[PDB]
């Protein structure tokens, strides 16, 4: 695995270049949204983002070295976490709002149209606000997102994955040392960033239950891909 031979700068550049595009929602200006319309836009968006996520994952150093089944397990476990931290990252410079797409910027009032979305909305806003107050950098973001990919399913199958995880940790520290942080500030920030991942996991878990709940209602048409990703959690 040539992932371990990379330097810290090489690791950063590899991840930055792997970044998936920012997709758009529909341009229909019909407001306000209904519950069906809101869910439709959100699920359609995620479905298209999933395709780019897979090509992003394959470009994450060390991921290609895994067997197909292992790659599948990791993405099935982490796909919603990855969508969420992406959403949270995009929403940083929009306090009080969530940027699902450049033409889909929502506040918490617009989350009440669908039952049980305000709970997750508030959690997502809280995470975004936390990233903003921490002044999260893009280089740190892509490290965190890759960590989610490799870590979230690693205990439900590993030494190779743990070694790649270690190198991303080394990269994160390298970035902080580069930004002028002291040794003490380096491990403190490292800890703060990783603890937020526990909350992202929590949000994903709450999110997955609601998606399943709407799978049992047969109202919003979920794509077969989305259904298969969802089914892996049941």
């Amino acid at each position: 695995s040539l992932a371990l031979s990379l330097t810290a700068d090489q690791m950063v550049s590899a991840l930055l270049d792997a970044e998936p595009p920012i997709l758009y929602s529909e341009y229909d200006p019909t407001r306000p949204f209904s519950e069906a319309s809101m869910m439709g836009l959100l699920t359609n968006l995620a479905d298209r983002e999933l395709v780019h996520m897979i090509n992003w994952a394959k470009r994450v150093p060390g991921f290609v070295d895994l067997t197909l089944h292992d790659q599948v397990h990791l993405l099935e476990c982490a796909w919603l976490e990855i969508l969420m931290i992406g959403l949270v990252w995009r929403s940083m410079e929009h306090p009080g709002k969530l940027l699902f797409a450049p033409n889909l910027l929502l506040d918490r009032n617009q989350g009440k149209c669908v039952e049980g979305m305000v709970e997750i909305f508030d959690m997502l806003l809280a995470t975004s606000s936390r990233f903003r107050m921490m002044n999260l950098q893009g280089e740190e973001f892509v490290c965190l997102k890759s960590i989610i990919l490799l870590n979230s399913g690693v205990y439900t199958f590993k030494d190779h994955i743990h070694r790649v995880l270690d190198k991303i940790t080394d990269t994160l520290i390298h970035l902080m040392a580069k930004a002028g942080l002291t040794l003490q500030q380096q491990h403190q920030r490292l800890a703060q960033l990783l603890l937020i991942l526990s909350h992202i996991r929590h949000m994903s878990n709450k999110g997955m239950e609601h998606l399943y709940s709407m799978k049992c209602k047969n109202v919003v048409p979920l794509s077969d891909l989305l259904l298969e990703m969802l089914d892996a959690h049941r």
């Binding site: 897979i54 197909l68 599948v72 993405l75 891909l225 990703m229």
Partner: peptide, 10 residues
């Protein structure tokens, strides 16, 4: 089998 299989293999 799995759409995810196809997307990963392209």
């Amino acid at each position: 089998h799995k759409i995810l299989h196809r997307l990963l293999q392209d």
